[PDB]
C-alpha cells in the first residue's frame, strides 16, 4: 500500500 492500506 502507498501508506496504510490493504495488508498485502
Amino acid at each position, epitope marked *: *500500500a*502507498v*501508506g*496504510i*492500506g*490493504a*495488508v*498485502f
Partner: antibody
Amino acid sequence: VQLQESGPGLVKPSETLSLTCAVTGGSISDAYYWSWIRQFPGKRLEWIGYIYGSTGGTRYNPPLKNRVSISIDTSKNQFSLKLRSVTAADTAVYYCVRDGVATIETTGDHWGQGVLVTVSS
Amino acid sequence: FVLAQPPSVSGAPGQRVTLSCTGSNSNIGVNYVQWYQQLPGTAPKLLIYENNKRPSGVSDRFSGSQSGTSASLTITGLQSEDEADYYCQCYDISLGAHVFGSGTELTVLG
C-alpha cells in the same frame, strides 16, 4: 485530494468521542482505505481502524473493536469515527488519512491536520 | 512497541546516517515497511512505502531497505532541515493491526 477533521473539543469520561472527516477533491466511494490514526501526548502513534470506500467494509485495531465504529456518509462525502466509553487514556490528536494513489509519481498518502480531543471532567 | 527503534541518532552535516527498525517474523519479516517523517507541529509525512519506494517530492537523499526482520531508513548528505522524528510502520499478523515504531529523534550536529 484534501481531508479535514471536525472541530477540537472536550469529552467527559465515559462518554462517546465522535469525529467526522470531510473529503474534497475526490470521492469517499473510491477504492481507497480511510483510516483514523491518533497520536498521544508523548508522541506514540496508534492506528485505530479503516473503512474501504468502495464497500464500507471495516477493520479495527482488535483491542478497540468493542468500542469503535467507523462509517461513511455518501451524501456529505465524509467518513466518521465513534469511540465509546472514553477515558483520559484516549486524549490524543486524531488524524483522518487516506492511502495514496498507486502510480510511480504518487505524492504519498493524504493526512488531515489532526484534531485535539481531550477527555476530562 | 512491536517495532523497536533507537530513541536518538545524530549525524554531522553532509554525512550519511541510518535509522534502524527492528521487528519480528510477524511484521517486517513478511509485510511492507513504511517510513514517516514528522516535523514540529505537523502531521506525519510519508517518506518511504513498500520497503523502498519513494513518492514524488521526497528528496533522493532518502532511501529505504529491508532484510529479514529489520528495516532501515538511509539519509545521505545530511542537512539541518532533516531534523525531525522518524517512525517506521508495518502490519503485524499476530496482533492483526497496522503498527508504528517507537520513533527515532534525529539531531544534526555542529
